[PDB]
Amino acid sequence: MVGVTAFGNFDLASLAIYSFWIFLAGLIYYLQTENMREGYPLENEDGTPAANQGPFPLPKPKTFILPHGRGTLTVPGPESEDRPIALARTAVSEGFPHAPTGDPMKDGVGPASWVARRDLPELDGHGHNKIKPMKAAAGFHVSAGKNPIGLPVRGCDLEIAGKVVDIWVDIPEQMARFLEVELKDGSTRLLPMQMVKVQSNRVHVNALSSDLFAGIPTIKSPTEVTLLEEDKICGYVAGGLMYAAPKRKSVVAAMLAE
Amino acid sequence: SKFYKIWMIFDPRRVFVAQGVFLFLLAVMIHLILLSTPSYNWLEISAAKYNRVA
Amino acid sequence: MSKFYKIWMIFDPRRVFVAQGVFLFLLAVMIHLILLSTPSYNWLEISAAKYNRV
Amino acid sequence: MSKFYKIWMIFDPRRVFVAQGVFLFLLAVMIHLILLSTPSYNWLEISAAKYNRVA
Amino acid sequence: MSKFYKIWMIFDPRRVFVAQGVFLFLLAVMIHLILLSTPSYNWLEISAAKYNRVA
Amino acid sequence: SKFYKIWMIFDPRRVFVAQGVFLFLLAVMIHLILLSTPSYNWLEISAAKYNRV
Amino acid sequence: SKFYKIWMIFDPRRVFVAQGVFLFLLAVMIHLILLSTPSYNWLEISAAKYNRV
Amino acid sequence: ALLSFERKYRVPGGTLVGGNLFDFWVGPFYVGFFGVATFFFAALGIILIAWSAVLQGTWNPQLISVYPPALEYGLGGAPLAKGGLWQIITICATGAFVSWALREVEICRKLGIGYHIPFAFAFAILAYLTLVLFRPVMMGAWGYAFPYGIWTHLDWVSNTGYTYGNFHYNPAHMIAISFFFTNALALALHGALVLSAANPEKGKEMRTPDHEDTFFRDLVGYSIGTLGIHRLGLLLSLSAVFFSALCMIITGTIWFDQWVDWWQWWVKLPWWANIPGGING
Amino acid sequence: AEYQNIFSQVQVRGPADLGMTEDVNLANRSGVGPFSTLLGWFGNAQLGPIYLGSLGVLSLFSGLMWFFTIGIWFWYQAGWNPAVFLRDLFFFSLEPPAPEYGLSFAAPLKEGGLWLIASFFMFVAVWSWWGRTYLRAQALGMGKHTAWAFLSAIWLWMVLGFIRPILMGSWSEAVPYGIFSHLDWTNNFSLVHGNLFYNPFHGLSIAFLYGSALLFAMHGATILAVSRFGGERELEQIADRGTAAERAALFWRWTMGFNATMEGIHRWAIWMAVLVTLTGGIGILLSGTVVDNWYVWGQNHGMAPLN
Amino acid sequence: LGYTGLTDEQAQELHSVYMSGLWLFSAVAIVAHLAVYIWRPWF
Amino acid sequence: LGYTGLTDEQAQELHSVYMSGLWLFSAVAIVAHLAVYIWRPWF
Amino acid sequence: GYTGLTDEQAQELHSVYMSGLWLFSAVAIVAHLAVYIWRPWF
Amino acid sequence: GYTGLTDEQAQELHSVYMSGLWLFSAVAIVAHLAVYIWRPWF
Amino acid sequence: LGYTGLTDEQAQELHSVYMSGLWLFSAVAIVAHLAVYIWRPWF
Ligand code: BCL
Ligand SMILES: COC(C)(C)C/C=C/C(C)=C/C=C/C(C)=C/C=C/C(C)=C/C=C/C=C(C)/C=C/C=C(\C)CC/C=C(\C)CCC=C(C)C
Ligand SMILES: COC(C)(C)C/C=C/C(C)=C/C=C/C(C)=C/C=C/C(C)=C/C=C/C=C(C)/C=C/C=C(\C)CC/C=C(\C)CCC=C(C)C
Ligand SMILES: COC(C)(C)C/C=C/C(C)=C/C=C/C(C)=C/C=C/C(C)=C/C=C/C=C(C)/C=C/C=C(\C)CC/C=C(\C)CCC=C(C)C
Ligand SMILES: COC(C)(C)C/C=C/C(C)=C/C=C/C(C)=C/C=C/C(C)=C/C=C/C=C(C)/C=C/C=C(\C)CC/C=C(\C)CCC=C(C)C
Ligand SMILES: COC(C)(C)C/C=C/C(C)=C/C=C/C(C)=C/C=C/C(C)=C/C=C/C=C(C)/C=C/C=C(\C)CC/C=C(\C)CCC=C(C)C
Ligand SMILES: COC(C)(C)C/C=C/C(C)=C/C=C/C(C)=C/C=C/C(C)=C/C=C/C=C(C)/C=C/C=C(\C)CC/C=C(\C)CCC=C(C)C
Ligand SMILES: COC(C)(C)C/C=C/C(C)=C/C=C/C(C)=C/C=C/C(C)=C/C=C\C=C(C)\C=C\C=C(/C)CC/C=C(\C)CCC=C(C)C
Ligand SMILES: [Fe+2]
């Protein structure tokens, strides 16, 4: 069919290219609707549904049957924050920042925010706790790199606020997730392995200052950590990057300081 | 024959889907082969028989 | 030859039947395509030259 | 070579038979394609020259 | 040489025979293809010239 | 001598597998080197001797 | 001398493996260098000597 | 215009420039200082492309082509009708890109997430700056850059590619193509695996990460892990771009002949350059 | 100058994970291989176990014979010379038959006949492996997304070597088995068909190949950015949306106006890569069979300045 | 033994039907080959 | 012995069937090769 | 014994393997002898 | 030691291994003798 | 004194065996070099 045109320059190649534009337009519509199963319908800055919802309608709900008898999850579904947001409107007009009413790191707002996940430990495929301390882990040991256990923990203010005691390990993935840092008060906090930089002789935590180490949310059980506790810990530490900028001694922090 | 027992071995749903797709694909393939040949191109056969071409 | 039935004691009939069905179809396509490849045994061209459809 | 039957005490029959069928089919195709490769023994061409099917 | 049976105390017969089966076939194919490659020992071509099968 | 003690240090499974691979690759490498050379290419020279070409 | 104490510091398994690879690679390197030179290629030498080519 | 969870993350701070002067949201977009620069450079760049269509005399979007200045003008200014517009658009495009990356930086600080995304985007910009800025400057002419046309910047690729014979033999190109193919292979595998573990056979429970590792261990005998695959995705993409930037910055600057001629060094190695047989001699 | 999570700063080595056992025949599954510290810096250190069933064996046997057949022809082209073999390794090639033979299997064994044998082994090898991906997913009860994502790759692979040669009625149109030859085949393909750049479907595949690099750079960086909140565990974020999923959602919502989910981003991922070869197969299939010159085709469709 | 889990009686029944199909399939093929050979033989 | 779990009698019976098929396959192969050598000998 | 086989089982396994090996070698010798008569390579 | 083989096991393992080594080398010597007679390389 | 956990007497015997192989290996090398020098000296 070389040069065979049904009409004008339209031929088999022209047939295919237009038919794909129709397919691609349909496919982009399908992909976008699937992305609308979370965070929708939209809401006003107060909490009421907005007059605008987008050109793409919501998809027909689908149900995820969670593992280990945790139940089912149907999305799109009614989603609620399930926590008081300690934020204050800074302007009646929308599209303006909300300032924290008090201490944002303690109030869990902004970069220090967290979500009301299920207050249960995350399970592996066998039903055991995915994240366990290396002491309670069976056979786990440091295989390479500098062992952070026993190293002093230095905050962003260049002050030592404790030392590492234990490492928490994701048992299926077999990689470290948390550092169990013991403070000066005898209690041990959890620090995500992604927020620390194990140097030659110390654990430098650029996120938090020495005084803020005590403020990390604690775990209910020393042998396991729930999803909710992970979010509070991960939120608090990562919230320290913006909310401990005045306490950071870095040169770039001073340049970007207010 | 006792060929009915194959439905105890094979799931009817999957088999029927396989038959439909295979028969359709086979039907298209033979028709496309025939059109490809200068002979058996019944569009061209009718054109020559009734002198459609001018 | 008279005791071949014991293969079905060892092999799952589901897997063997699918494998045989795929094999026979693919083999049949291969041979029919091999003949069409050569100028001879192209029964489409054979009848075309036989009745002078050109 | 009576003791040959002992091979099944170690080999799993399912694995051997699958290997056997795979091997023989792949071997059979390879020889048939090799024969078709040579201008002689190409049984789809010697008959064509014999009966003058193709000019 | 009489103690060569001790090899089966170390090597798994299943692993060895799979390794040997692959080895022997790949060796046999390699040798056969070497002969076909050479202008001589290409027994298909040899008999073709012998029997005037070129034409 | 007392070379038998090397098996106390070396795992027999690893060595025999390594040796079996080593010997075959050495045998293959040597045979190909001879086949490469116009001399010792025993296929080529026999064809020349009997005038196969 | 006291060279036996080198085994108090080195793992015998790793050293023997490294030595086994090292000697073979050294033997191959020397044998290839001899073949590379126009002289000492014993395959070439025999062919010229016995008039194989 | 807010998601069901967006409110608690909308807080001041994190801005690099301007403080609260531009710290506001227009719909879903966050504006920032660099977003204002983004919108201006984006709008100005788009209009000059449309205005360049007027000067060219065509309205077909595929025929629209903003050619760079000819080789005679070197690396100086050019008339707007014959190259000058391209220089303004390139400056606008460069401004829009870097402002976009820096705007992403502000959003990163406001959310407290890592700067991997703007660092990943900066690799693309340096890839872009390689073609339009770094390579033409070394070759001393804006005309070696590519026109801003849908099908005329392909003519540049084909013409530049065939200047050096078959461009496939570019060694840095072979590395980058292997990375681009590998990244797409990884993305298809990674996307399909999670969907298979999240949208399994009907009725069966949603699968766990262990099934993801079990599937690929039963498949190819090794699972890189959830953390590894996203590290792999980032590094495969950046390496592809890094070697693509490298492949062009050495072409016409360090290598000038056909790239197939380059590969003869391996054939001409001292210990086998003269052995008979094979492909080369 | 902080920890960017690109490489693990510590490794832990527990017992080897033997994997799930939903419906996988453990007899066909092998044992656990070594632990690679070098691999452990980037991802998991454990290698194996690997499942080997009926389709696994057929895939390996045909895959080995395909690999072996190319190697023997590579040795024959080298004159059985190891030095020549390493010198001309990339320049070796198992060329398909000459255009004169068309689709006939009458090509001499050294003139294209061997390629047909090697190509048959690859054909069986790949198709048997596709079923292996299908059956491994079915065994664990997962979706067949990999099986159909793979079938996209097969479509381009089938087109280049099998389908397009049949339509062109010649094995000479197929791909040679070599490093530089199949590069030269690629270049010769465009030149014969008149600047394959102006192929609309080739342009689309580049769009999705660029987009796959774009999306994976975007997606990989996003998860590493939110890995400090445990965002790398994407399956739990799909099940129970944590703060990482929300921040990842918000970053792209505030950046480009729209976002995705933790599960919907992987739908973009699979379709972005599938269309790479899906549009690729059509693009190659049309070339020659429908369009003998794309630049002339581009001129008549308003893609080139002339005409 | 008995990996399939089938019974010997079931195995005999399954093989009996299977061979019945095989002879039918082979019978068609033999007729098919005979007709083709008469129409155009390859020997 | 324990690698397969079969007994000597099962292996003896299993081998007997396998060789029965093997000789049938071999016999048909021999007849096939003779047909080729008669019609077109390759030596 | 890594494989766990007893010596008597290994003696049986070797006996079958060597019987197979000699039969395989025996056919190979006939094959080489037949080829050398048909076309010697020395 | 590392492998857990007893000294008697090591001696037996070495004894058969050397039996194989001399058997392998014996055929290699005969092979080199035959090649040198047929075509010497010195 | 405990890098490898090897006893000092074990090291003495291990080295004694190792040197025995080293002299045996070098003895063949000397015989190999001697034959080559007779066959083709390199000085
Ligand atoms: C001068 C050369 C020509 C040209 C000629 C071609 C040709 C010809 C083709 C492409 C194709 C492609 N080109 Mg182009 N291309 C050119 C310029 C470009 C430029 C550029 C910036 O200039 C780019 C980015 C591209 C980009 C691309 C890709 C989008 C596309 C290939 C997808 C893919 O993954 O294929 C590679 C992947 C596969 C082929 C799939 C393989 C799948 C199978 C199943 C794998 C089996 C594995 C096997 C058994 C081995 C196993 C090994 C063991 C695992 C160890 N081209 C110029 C214009 N291009 C292809 C296409 O589809 O075009 C529409 C194509 O055929
Ligand atoms: C381009 O330049 C050219 C090549 C032209 C010229 C070259 C120039 C240059 C710059 C040349 C460089 C020369 C240098 C720097 C040479 C250095 C040589 C050295 C440092 C040699 C040292 C050798 C040491 C040896 C061999 C030691 C051996 C030790 C043992 C055998 C015993 C070890 C065992 C022990 C210690 C047991 C452990 C003990 C206990 C108690 C457990
Ligand atoms: C390149 O090489 C070429 C192609 C040129 C030459 C080809 C060479 C080769 C390699 C050729 C290979 C040929 C082969 C291997 C052919 C094999 C053919 C066979 C064995 C075919 C068997 C067919 C069997 C069939 C169709 C059986 C059908 C059975 C049924 C329909 C009934 C099934 C129902 C049952 C059992 C229900 C009973 C169930 C219960 C539970 C009681
Ligand atoms: C490049 O080289 C070329 C291609 C030129 C030349 C090729 C050379 C080479 C390398 C050729 C290689 C040839 C080889 C190794 C051939 C091997 C052939 C063999 C071993 C064939 C064996 C066939 C066996 C068959 C067909 C047996 C079938 C058995 C049955 C159907 C019955 C099985 C049933 C049983 C066991 C019942 C189950 C029992 C119980 C108690 C449940
Ligand atoms: C490039 O070099 C060229 C190709 C030119 C020249 C080639 C050079 C080289 C490198 C050649 C290499 C040759 C080699 C290494 C040949 C080795 C051959 C061997 C070792 C063959 C062995 C054959 C053994 C066979 C066929 C044994 C078969 C046994 C059976 C069928 C029975 C199996 C059943 C058993 C053992 C039952 C188990 C019993 C109990 C009680 C558990
Ligand atoms: C480029 O260089 C060229 C190629 C030109 C020249 C070559 C140069 C080089 C580098 C040549 C290298 C030569 C080498 C390193 C040769 C080494 C040969 C050796 C060491 C061969 C050893 C052979 C040993 C054999 C075959 C042993 C066989 C043993 C058995 C069959 C019995 C095994 C069973 C056992 C041990 C049972 C275990 C016992 C118990 C009680 C469990
Ligand atoms: C470019 O340079 C050219 C190529 C031109 C010239 C080359 C130059 C150079 C740099 C040459 C380098 C030469 C070197 C460094 C040679 C070194 C040779 C050595 C040190 C060889 C050592 C050999 C040792 C052997 C073979 C030892 C064997 C020992 C055994 C088989 C017995 C092992 C068993 C034991 C210890 C049992 C364990 C005992 C107990 C009580 C547990
Ligand atoms: C020393 O090394 C040894 C010898 C041990 C082993 C080494 C092997 C080596 C060096 C292997 C090298 C392999 C290479 C360089 C492979 C490269 C492959 C490439 C670059 C392939 C690229 C494209 C290939 C494509 C698209 C192939 C497609 C094929 C198909 C779709 C199958 C077509 C099916 C056909 C023609 C069936 C025809 C047959 C019948 C019976 C109908
Ligand atoms: Fe992901």
> After which residues does a break in chain B occur, C–N more than 2.5 Å?
none
Q: Which residues line ligand 5 (CB under 6 A)?
A: D 4, 6-7, 9-10; E 27, 30-31, 34; F 24, 27-28, 31-32; L 9, 12-13, 16-17, 20-21, 24
- List C-alpha distances in Å: I59 to E18, I128, I148, I150: 15, 5, 18, 15
SS3 readout for chain H: CECCCCHHHCCCCCCCCCCCCCCCEECCEECHHHHHHHHHHHHHHHHHHHHHHHHHCCCCCCCCCCCCCCHHHCCCCCCHHHCHHHHHHHHHHHHHHHHHHHHHHHHHHHHCCCCHHHHHHHHHHHHHHHHHHHHHHHHCCHHHCCCCCCCHHHHHHHHHHHHCCCHHHCHHHHHHHHHHHHHHHHHHHHHHHHHHHHCCCCCCCCCCHHHHHHHHHHHHCCCCCHHHHHHHHHHHHHHHHHHHHHHHHCECCCECCCHHHHCHHHHCCCCCCCCCCCCCC
Annotated binding site of D for a bacteriochlorophyll: 32
Residue J26 makes CB contacts below 8 A (sequence gap 6+) with: none
For testing contact with chain C, the best of I58, I100, I104 (most C CBs within 10 A): I104
Residue D53 CB coordination number (10 Å): 18
Spatial separation of the C-alpha atoms in residues K20 and K28, rounded to whole Å = 12
Name the residue of K6, K13, K18 whose CB sits within 8 Å of the most ligand 4 atoms, as the mutation to test its pocket: K18
Touch L-N: 3+ C-beta pairs under 8 A: no
Question: Which residues share a beta bridge with A133?
Answer: A168
* Spacing of C-alpha H239 from chain mean position: 11
Chain E residues whose CB is inside 8 A of the K3 CB are: 13-14
Is F24 near chain M, with CB under 8 Å?
no
Of D13, D14, D53, the CB nearest to C40: D53
Residue H40 CB coordination number (10 Å): 14
Residue B6 CA: nearest ligand 3 atom is 37
Instruction: List the single residue in B with minimal CA-CA distance to C13.
Output: B9
Are the Cβ atoms of M5 and F12 closer than 8 angstroms?
yes
For residue M21, report the distance from its CA to the centre of ligand 6, in Å. Answer: 7
For residue I56, report the distance from its CA to the centre of ligand 4, in Å. Answer: 19
Tokens found for residue A89 = 């409107």
Chain C residues whose CB is inside 8 A of the D54 CB are: 39-40
Going by C-alpha positions, the residue among H125, H259, H246, H231 that lies closest to residue H177 is H246
Going by C-alpha positions, the residue among A39, A80, A32 that lies closest to residue A59 is A32
Measured between alpha carbons, how far apart are the two ends of chain N, in Å? 47
Chain E residues whose CB is inside 8 A of the L8 CB are: none
| H1-163 and H164-263, same CATH topology | yes
- Fold classification of A12-116 is Photosynthetic Reaction Center; Chain H, domain 1 (4.10.540)
For residue M14, report the distance from its CA to the centre of ligand 6, in Å. Answer: 13
Answer whether H188's CB lies under 8 Å from I273's CB. Answer: yes
Tokens found for residue G24 = 């073979």
For residue J19, give how far its alpha carbon lies from the nearest alpha carbon of chain D (Å): 19
Stated in angstroms to one decimal place, the resolution of this structure is 2.9
Rounded to 5°, the CA angle H266-H272-H278 comes to 85
Spatial separation of the C-alpha atoms in residues H26 and H8, rounded to whole Å = 17
Half-sphere exposure in the Cβ direction for I15 (13 Å, CA): 6
Question: Which residues share a beta bridge with I94?
Answer: I177
Name the residue of N8, N10, N14 whose CB sits within 8 Å of the most ligand 7 atoms, as the mutation to test its pocket: N14
For residue E27, report the distance from its CA to the centre of ligand 5, in Å. Answer: 10
Domain regions of chain B by residue span: 4-50
Spatial separation of the C-alpha atoms in residues N3 and G7, rounded to whole Å = 9
Instruction: List the single residue in H with minimal CA-CA distance to I197.
Output: H154
* Dihedrals phi, psi of A165, to nearest 5 degrees: -115, -50
Q: Could you tell me where the beta strands, DSSP code E, fall in A44-115? A: 62-65, 72-75, 87-89, 98-100
Domain regions of chain A by residue span: 12-116, 117-248
Going by C-alpha positions, the residue among K37, C51, I106 that lies closest to residue D48 is I106
Answer whether H21's CB lies under 8 Å from H5's CB. Answer: no
Spatial separation of the C-alpha atoms in residues A177 and A157, rounded to whole Å = 24
Question: Which residues share a beta bridge with E45?
Answer: none
**Three-class SS state of A166:** strand
The CATH number given to E5-51 is 4.10.220.20
Domain regions of chain M by residue span: 1-42
Of A47, A50, A90, the CB nearest to H1: A50
- List C-alpha distances in Å: I247 to A216, H7, H86, I222, K32: 20, 11, 38, 9, 72
Answer whether F10's CB lies under 8 Å from E4's CB. Answer: no
Let me know if A209 is exposed, middle or buried by CB neighbors in 10 A (0-12, 13-18, 19+).
buried
Per-residue b/e over L3-23, b at no fewer than 16 CB within 10 Å? bebeeebbebbbebbeeeeee
Contacts within 8 Å (CB) and 24+ apart, I284-287: I284/I156, I284/I159, I284/I160, I284/I164, I284/I189, I284/I202, I285/I159, I285/I163, I285/I164, I285/I167, I286/A12, I286/A13, I286/A16, I286/I199, I286/I201, I287/I164, I287/I189, I287/I193, I287/I196, I287/I199
Residue whose Cα lies nearest atom 6 of ligand 5: it is F31
Let me know if I22 is exposed, middle or buried by CB neighbors in 10 A (0-12, 13-18, 19+).
middle
Pocket flag, ligand 7, residue N7 (CB < 6 Å): no
Q: Which method was it determined by? A: cryo-EM
Spatial separation of the C-alpha atoms in residues I103 and I163, rounded to whole Å = 12
For residue F50, give how far its alpha carbon lies from the nearest alpha carbon of chain L (Å): 9
Name the residue of J6, J14, J33 whose CB sits within 8 Å of the most ligand 3 atoms, as the mutation to test its pocket: J14
Answer whether I267's CB lies under 8 Å from A34's CB. Answer: yes
Answer whether A49's CB lies under 8 Å from H9's CB. Answer: no
Chain G residues whose CB is inside 8 A of the M42 CB are: 42, 46
* Type and span of the H or E element at I96: none
Question: Which residues share a beta bridge with H181?
Answer: none
For residue I200, report the distance from its CA to the centre of ligand 1, in Å. Answer: 15
Architecture of domain H1-163: Up-down Bundle (1.20)
- Fold classification of G4-50 is Light-harvesting Protein (4.10.220)
Residue type (1 letter), H83: G
Spatial separation of the C-alpha atoms in residues C43 and G33, rounded to whole Å = 63
Residue F21 CB coordination number (10 Å): 10
Spatial separation of the C-alpha atoms in residues D45 and L12, rounded to whole Å = 52
What is the CATH superfamily name and number for domain A117-248?
Answer: Photosynthetic Reaction Center, subunit H, domain 2 (3.90.50.10)
Spatial separation of the C-alpha atoms in residues I77 and H276, rounded to whole Å = 12
Are the Cβ atoms of G42 and M40 closer than 8 angstroms?
no
Residue F4 CA: nearest ligand 7 atom is 37
Rounded to 5°, the CA angle I198-I202-I206 comes to 115
CATH of H164-263, one of 1.20.85.10, 2.60.120.260, 3.30.365.10, 3.40.120.10: 1.20.85.10
Axis-axis angle for helices I54-77, I114-140 (nearest 10): 150
